[PDB]
Structure 1
Amino acid sequence: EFRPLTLPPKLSLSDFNEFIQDIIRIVGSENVEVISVDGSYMKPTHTHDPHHVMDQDYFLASAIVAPRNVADVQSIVGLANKFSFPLWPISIGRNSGYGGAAPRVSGSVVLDMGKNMNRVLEVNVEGAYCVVEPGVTYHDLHNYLEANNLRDKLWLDVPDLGGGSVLGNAVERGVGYTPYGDHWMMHSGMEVVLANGELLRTGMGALPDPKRPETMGLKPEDQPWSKIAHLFPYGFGPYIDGLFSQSNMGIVTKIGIWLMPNPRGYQSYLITLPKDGDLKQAVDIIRPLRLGMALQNVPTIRHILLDAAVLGDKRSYSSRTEPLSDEELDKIAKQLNLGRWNFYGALYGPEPIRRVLWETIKDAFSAIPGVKFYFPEDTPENSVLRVRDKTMQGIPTYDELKWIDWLPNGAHLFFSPIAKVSGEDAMMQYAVTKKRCQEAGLDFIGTFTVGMREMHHIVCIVFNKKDLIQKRKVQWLMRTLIDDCAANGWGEYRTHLAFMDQIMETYNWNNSSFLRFNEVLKNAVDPNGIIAPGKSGVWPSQYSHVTWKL
C-alpha cells in the first residue's frame, strides 16, 4: 500500500513503500494494512488508543502487520533494521487504560503477533503448566481446558476481564485474583526474537532438549523444550528474564506460565465495610492475615462507585455533571446493600481448613462495626460477588466492563501508584488522590489489590473521550497525581503511553542511575533503536530526549 497518514522518523515515502512491499511479499497482502476510528473491547483497534486522552490520532501506526509465524517476525526485524523502521509489538492490544494497541512513536509499524500466532502450545498436567503464543487470550485458554476436559485438574488465573493475552499481561507484570495472581512471577522459560533477529530461550530454555529422529531438522522456533524449561525459571548464570518485562529489550514469541491444580474446595465472599474511614482498620486487619496466609489469593478492597458502576451509568444514580457528594455515596451504598469499601476474597482447599481460615478472617473483621459477610448465594443475580466468584476461580468474564460506562463516552485511564499495607498509608494515599479528582471535577473510583506486603492502588479515571475540556482536566489530574504521590514516597507500577517519561523521571534516585543503566543496555542490544523506542521512557540514542519525551 501507497501513502500513510504518518511516517516513522526520517523515512521517505518511497522507503515506506519499498519496505511495505517486501513485507507484503513476506506475510501476504492479508497480513498488512497501511493507514492512509476506535473500536471495541470486543473488536479491538490496532492503530491507536481507543480510550484516547490525547488527540485520537496522537499516537498512531503507519501500517498494521501480522506475522504468520516466528520466521516472519525474524524477517520483519531484519527489514526494520535495514530501513530503521520502528516496531511496536502487541499480543492482543487490549492494553486500554494504558494506551491500547498504540505505539509510543507515531508512524511505527504495529505488529499484531496475536492474529496468526494464536496457539496453545502445551498444557502440562504433571508439571502443572501451559506454554503459549501471544494470540492466546484468557477465554481461549479456558475453552482450551474445557474442551480437553482439563478443568478438573487445573485452574487458570485471570485479571478482571477475559479478552487479554495470557502472554502480554504477564510481560506487563499484570495481575489477577487467585493465589497465583502475581502473573509475572508465574512464568518459566520464554522465547524472544532479539533486535538483531536472533532467537533466545530463557533459563532452562537454554538447555537444549536432547536429539531424536522425530525432532530432527525442525526450525529452532519449532523445537520442543528441555524437561525443566517450564518448571524452574532460573536456568544457570545471570537471570535475564526481567529485562523482558515492561521493556523494549525484545519480541516475545512464547512463554511458559504455571498452572494451579484444582484445590479441592473453594469459597468466595464479601465483607461490607460501612464507613469511608473504615479503609483504615480493614487494611491494618488485612495486613497480618495476608503475611500469614489466612488470606490466600490476591483479595481486593473496592470503592463503592466501582460496584455502583458495574451496576449502572452515572446517569442512573444522578443527573449531575458534578461529582457525587459523600452523602450521595452513602446513599448508593445503601441501595446496593454494599459498604463504602468492599472486600472480596476466596477460600481454597479442604473444607476442614477453609473452615478454620474463615473463622479467623470472620473474627478479625468483626472489630469493624456494621460489618457484614456474604456468599454469592446471599446476594442478587446481578451482584459483583457473583461475577468475582468466577473470577477468583480462574473463570473469565466481561461484566466488569460496564464500569467503563460511568460517563457518556467513557474511557478509562489508570493511575497506578503502590501503597504499603498500612491503614495509615493507604488512607493518606486515598486522600491525596481523592482531593485531586475533586479539583478536576471527577468522581474518584478505585480499588486496592492486596499483595503480600504491598498493595496496588488502581485509581479508575473514567472520562468522556469526546470532551476536550475534560480530556484536558484528565492530563492535568494525572501529571499532578504523579508528582503528589512521588512527593509522598510512592511511585506507579505500570502506566499509559503518555506518562511513561514522567513516571520514569520519578524513579530518580542518585541522578537517574536507573534510566541511565537502562539506556546503556538497550543501545547495546538495539544499536538501531528498532524495537519499541520510548517504552517505559527508555529511549534508543537515535531518539532525542528533547524531541521525544512528554
Structure 2
Amino acid sequence: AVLPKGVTQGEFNKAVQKFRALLGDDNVLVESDQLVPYNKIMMPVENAAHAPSAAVTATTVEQVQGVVKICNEHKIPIWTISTGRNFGYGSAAPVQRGQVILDLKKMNKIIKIDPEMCYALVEPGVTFGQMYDYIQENNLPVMLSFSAPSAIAGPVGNTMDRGVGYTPYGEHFMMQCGMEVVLANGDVYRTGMGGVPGSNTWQIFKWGYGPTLDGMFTQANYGICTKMGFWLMPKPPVFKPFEVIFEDEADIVEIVDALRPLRMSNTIPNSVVIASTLWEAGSAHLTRAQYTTEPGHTPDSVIKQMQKDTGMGAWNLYAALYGTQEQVDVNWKIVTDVFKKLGKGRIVTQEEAGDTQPFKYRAQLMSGVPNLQEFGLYNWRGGGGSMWFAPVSEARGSECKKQAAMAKRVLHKYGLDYVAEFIVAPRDMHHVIDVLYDRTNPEETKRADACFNELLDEFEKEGYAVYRVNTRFQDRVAQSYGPVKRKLEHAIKRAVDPNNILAPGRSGIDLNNDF
C-alpha cells in the first residue's frame, strides 16, 4: 500500500473517510486501477518513486477549502494539478511518492471571455481545446496562445509552471492578470484588483496595490490556484507565418544576432522558434530507425543525409507577422531585407509550404490553434523516455552556439541526441532540449539519468540554469539558484503552510529541508 511519507494507515484512512464525505465516493480514487493514469511518467526512474497514495477530484472552491482542512488535520501532503499534461516535467504524478493528488480537472468553467477588453477568466480544468472551440464557434475576435502538444492541457496549469506559446502572447505568465488561490489555512486570496469588493478590473490591471503576489505562487507550493485570468490577443486582420532555413550548425550565431533586433523592435512580434534538425525531423514524424538502428547518438553524417533527403536545415526558424495587410507588407520588406543582407537563410512562405509538415503545425502554433503534431517527438526513439532540459540563454548568437555545443557534447557522451529549439523572446531564449531515450531499456534509462545530471552540472559550470524541470530534478535545480533564495523560500513556506501539506518538494521547497 502506498501511503504518504511518514503517515500511518490509520490517519490516511481518516483523511479518505473525510475526503469521501466532502467530495463523494466517485471523487476519491484509491484503487490501483484508478491510479494508473496518474502514475505514468517519462522520467528515468521506476513508477514507484512517484506513485500517489490517492487522487481526489474537487469541483468547487469550497471543496478545495475542505480538502486543505482535512490535509492539515491528518498531515496529508497534496500534489495539485489542473489539466495534468505536464509531459517531460513529471506528467500528473506527484513530486514525492505517497502524496495525494488534488486533481482540479473537474473545476472546468470558462467564467468569462471579454472580446472587447480581450481577456479570459477561467478555472483550472479549462483546456486549450475547450477555449478554442468556444471562441471559434461564437466567432469571437480573439486568439489563444497555445502550448504544445496537448489540446487537453490548459492555461492555468501551463501558467503555474510558467510555460510558453508561440504567438506575441507566448510568454504566458507575462500575460496573466488576476489569480485566486486557496491558501493552506483555507483562506481564498485574490491577487491584484480581485480583493476589491465589486471590482471589474481583476483581469484588467495586473498589480493591484501593495505586494503583487501572482509570481510568488507560480512554480511554488504556497497556495492552490482555483481561478486565473489572462490577456488575449485580438484577432488580427492578417496572419503571415513564414520560415527561414539555414544549412549549417555554425549559422546559429548569425541567425540569432540578425533576429534579435527584429524581435527587439517588435517587427517580428511572436515567440519565434529556431529548431534543430532533429527537432524538425521528429515534429515531422520521422524516426531515428528510418535512418539508422546503430547504437549511440545519431551521427552528424546521418543528419546531413537527413537534411539532403528532406530539405530540413541545421536550423529551422519559424516566425510570423500580424496586423493589417499594409503593416504586414512593410514588416515583410524589413524582414526579407535583413536575411538578404545576411546572405544566409532560405525563406519559405505559407503558400509554398502548403499542408506539409512541419510548416503546417508551426503555422497553427503561431496562430494559437491547438494541435497534436509534436507528439511526434516521443517517437524519434520511442520507449516513453523524455525529459526537458531547458536552460535560459541570452538571445546572443555566441551564447546560443556555446550552449548548443555543450549540450551536444554531453548528450553524445551518453549516446543520446541533441534535439532542441530556441524559443525566442527579445532578450532571452528558452533553449529547450528534449532528452529522449528508451525508458523500457534499463541500461539506456540509467544513461539518461546520468546524462541529465551531467547536463545540469556542465551548464551550471558556465553560469546557466534551467527555467523549469521535471519532478525528479526539482530539488537539484533549486540548488542552482543558491542558498539565500532557498532559505527565503522556506521562511515563506513556514508562514503560509506550517504543516507542510502543499506539495512539499515542489521547486525544492519542503519544510523537512534544513533551510
Give the TM-score band, short-chain normalised.
Answer: over 0.9
Q: State yes or no: 1:535 paired with 2:506.
A: yes
1:365 to 323, 332, 339: 339
Tell me which of 267, 284, 307 is aligned to 2:240.
Answer: 267
| Cα shift at 1:318 | 2.0
- In structure 2, the partner of 1:147 is 137
Q: Which of 375, 387, 391 is the aligned partner of 2:361?
A: 387
- Paired position in structure 2 for 1:60: 51
Q: Check whether the contact 1:38–1:50 (CA below 8 A) recurs between aligned residues.
A: no
For residues 463 and 545 of structure 1, the distance between their equivalents in structure 2, rounded to whole angstroms, comes to: 34
Q: CA deviation at 1:454?
A: 0.8
Q: Does 1:522 align with 2:493?
A: yes
CA distance in structure 2 between the partners assigned to 1:435 and 1:484 by the alignment: 10
Equivalent position SS for 1:486? helix
Q: Distance in 2 between matches of 1:37 and 1:356?
A: 58
Q: TM-score, with normalisation over the residues of structure 2?
A: 0.97
Q: Is the 8 A contact 1:67 1:112 kept in 2?
A: yes
Q: Is 1:176 aligned with 2:176?
A: no
Partner in structure 2 of residue 229 of structure 1: 202
Mapped to 1, the partners of 2:294 and 2:333 lie a distance apart of 43
Provide the C-alpha distance between the structure 2 equivalents of 1:234 and 1:480, rounded to a whole number of angstroms.
Answer: 39
Q: In the TM superposition, what whole-angstrom CA distance separates every residue of 1:178-209 from its partner, at most 9, and x where no partner exists?
A: 11111011111111100101101111001111
Asked whether the 8 Å contact 2:296–2:412 carries over to 1, the reply is: no
Match of 1:29 among 25, 37, 40: 25
| Partner SS for 2:228 | strand
Match of 2:3 among 7, 10, 16: 7
CA shift for structure 1 position 47: 2.6
User: After superposition, where does 1:457-536 map in structure 2 within 5 Å?
Assistant: 457-508=431-482, 512-536=483-507
Amino acid at match of 1:469: E
Deviation of the 1:410 alpha carbon: 3.4
SS state at 2:49 partner: coil
CA contact (8 A) 2:44 2:449 kept: yes
Alignment of 1:250-329 (within 5 A): 250-310=223-283, 311-329=285-303
Aligned counterparts of 1:526 and 1:194: Cα–Cα separation in 2: 8
Superposition pairs for residues 402-413 of structure 1, below 5 Å? Answer: 402-413=376-387
| Aligned-pair CA distance for 1:231 | 0.4
Q: CA deviation at 1:174?
A: 0.7
> Which residue pairs with 2:192 in the alignment?
203
The structure-2 alpha-carbon separation of the partners of 1:460 and 1:122, relative to structure 1 and needing over 3 Å to count, comes to: same
Of residues 140, 153, 157, the one that matches 1:164 is 153
Moved more, 311-320 or 496-505: 311-320
Residue identity matched to 1:138: F
Could you say which residue in structure 2 is the equivalent of 1:77?
A: 68
Secondary structure, counterpart of 1:412 in structure 2: strand
What count of residue pairs does the alignment treat as equivalent? 513
Q: Aligned-residue CA RMSD in angstroms? A: 1.6
Please state if 1:111 is matched with 2:102.
yes
Deviation of the 1:544 alpha carbon? 4.1
Alignment correspondent of 1:420: 394
Q: Please say which of residues 388-397 and 10-19 is displaced more in the overlay.
A: 10-19
Counterpart-to-counterpart distance in 2, 1:355 and 1:400: 30
Deviation readout 1:21-56 (Å, 9 max, x if unpaired):
1111111111111145899xxxxx653242131112
Structure 2 counterpart of 1:149, which letter?
N
Cα deviation, residue 369, structure 1: 4.8
TM-score (ref. length: structure 1): 0.91
Q: Secondary structure at the match of 2:240?
A: strand
Q: Deviations over 1:265-295 (max 9, x none)?
A: 1100011001111111101111111111122
CA distance in 2, matches of 1:376, 1:348: 13
What's the secondary structure of 2:418's corresponding residue?
coil
1:377 aligns to 2:351 (yes or no): yes
User: In 2, Cα distance between the equivalents of 1:373 and 1:53?
Assistant: 39
Q: Which moved more, 1:405-414 or 1:29-38?
A: 29-38
1:36–1:397 CA distance, 2 compared to 1 (3 A): closer
Deviation, structure 1 residue 370: 5.5
Do the aligned partners of residues 239 and 46 (structure 1) sit closer, same or farther apart at CA in structure 2, a change above 3 Å counting? Answer: farther
The equivalent residue for 1:400 is 374
- Does residue 122 (structure 1) correspond to residue 112 (structure 2)? The answer is yes
Q: 1:19 aligns with which of 15, 20, 39?
A: 15
Q: Is the 8 A contact 1:301 1:343 kept in 2?
A: yes
Q: CA deviation at 1:297?
A: 0.5
Q: Is the 8 A contact 2:273 2:424 kept in 1?
A: yes
Aligned residue identity for 2:15: F
SS at 2:379 equivalent: helix
Distance of 1:126 and 1:438 partners within structure 2: 51
Q: Residue type of the partner of 2:228?
A: I
Which deviates more from structure 2 when the two are superposed, residues 260-269 or residues 320-329?
320-329
Unaligned runs of 5+ residues in structure 1 are 40-44, 210-225
CA apart distance, 1:384: 0.8
Determine helix, strand or coil for the equivalent of 1:47.
helix
Q: Which residue of 2 aligns with 1:136?
A: 126
